[PDB]
A paper describes a structure:
Microtubule associated protein 2 (MAP2) interacts with the regulatory protein 14‐3‐3ζ in a cAMP‐dependent protein kinase (PKA) phosphorylation dependent manner. Using selective phosphorylation, calorimetry, nuclear magnetic resonance, chemical crosslinking, and X‐ray crystallography, we characterized interactions of 14‐3‐3ζ with various binding regions of [name].
Although PKA phosphorylation increases the affinity of [name] for 14‐3‐3ζ in the proline rich region and C‐terminal domain, unphosphorylated [name] also binds the dimeric 14‐3‐3ζ via its microtubule binding domain and variable central domain. Monomerization of 14‐3‐3ζ leads to the loss of affinity for the unphosphorylated residues.
Numbering used by the authors:
A (entry chain E): -3 to 2
B (entry chain F): 5 to 10
C (entry chain B): 4 to 209, 215 to 233
D (entry chain A): 5 to 233
The structure:
Amino acid sequence: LKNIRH
Amino acid sequence: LKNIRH
Amino acid sequence: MDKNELVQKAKLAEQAERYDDMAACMKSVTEQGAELSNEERNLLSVAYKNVVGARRSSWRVVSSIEQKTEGAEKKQQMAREYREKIETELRDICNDVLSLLEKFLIPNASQAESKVFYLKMKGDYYRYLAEVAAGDDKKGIVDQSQQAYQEAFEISKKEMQPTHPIRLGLALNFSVFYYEILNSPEKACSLAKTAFDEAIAELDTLKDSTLIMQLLRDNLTLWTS
Amino acid sequence: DKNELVQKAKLAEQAERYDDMAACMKSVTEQGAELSNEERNLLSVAYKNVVGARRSSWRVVSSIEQKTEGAEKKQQMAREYREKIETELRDICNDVLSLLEKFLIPNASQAESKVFYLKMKGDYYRYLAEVAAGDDKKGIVDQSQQAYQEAFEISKKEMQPTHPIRLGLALNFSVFYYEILNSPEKACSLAKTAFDEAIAELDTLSEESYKDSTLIMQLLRDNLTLWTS
């Protein structure tokens, strides 16, 4: 539920 | 994480 | 397992947007059996609003997909069982809240406001249950939703001023129940107008009332068109 | 059935139920065959969301723990809550790293997918390191670094500077240098080089990769602005 360092 | 008819 | 500590956890969980933890904490606070403070009541309500609201929102998506996959029968069936998974969760959440409501919150309610708040909540969770109930089950549950809102409505008319946000919030959700669940636009519209009407009589005195009054109007616009 | 697990993952994605999405892509992986591009991307998107939520919650709670210094009981309650969240973090990372070690890295038969998975390994090791203690932390930082370096070398040889995986690798490795090893210089130079090389070979940026590359290039150039200010 959260786009994350990528 | 959603809110509803309440 | 201390009330002060459960409440602070509930607040941390809320900040962290971990609503399941937020609910479980407030569940535990309720299960210690004393009447909830206004603060604790609101935390509990917010928490389960979010928990149940996630599943309702998911269900609508998967349900829409199931409908749009008619003809592609194996794919529809995949959506159907996944919908059932989400329904099971939804029933569990509703059963949890309704049990809390029955054992603790309704019996412990010592003032009109809080009794109304909790009966409304009972109508709410019965409503959500009914939306994913089957056949003869659904009929009974819709009736229980109606009884709880009606009790709430009757106490609020006798014991709260027409502006109170809990009294207005009840009118909003009850009229929604009539529109969406019982398919009675006439009854829905009537209930919403009466409540708006009775509130306006005393807006001169006092907020969050206005916001609910606005929601009443909004629903009315939607339903007529 | 593989077809079925993949459909479920997609439904779960539509429903924004990322734990379910991850579980079925986990199952797809444990069947032991090389993932298709679609499956790999599903898997990575699923765990991106799973891990991302926890990383977000961690930061909020860590911030509260900080700001409550002086109110020692409030801080303790934050601290314990942060450790709860950390326990979930570790588990998720350990799950993905095990998947990577046992299935995805062994079965990667093209350079692109090798780099994708080594990058992913660097990522999850980074997340682990972010919440590890003392002597355990040093070792995990080093594992992050080795997985990114190996990725970086393969990508330099096998992929155009405009390739979104090579760019995404440059972004995250630069972030590792900055946030984990406290080397703004090294972070900034990696980011600068990847950005400049992509621009200089902009002619190679394909139609299908245009959106992802440019977003990453944006993240690179923003990072570079922040760091050199």
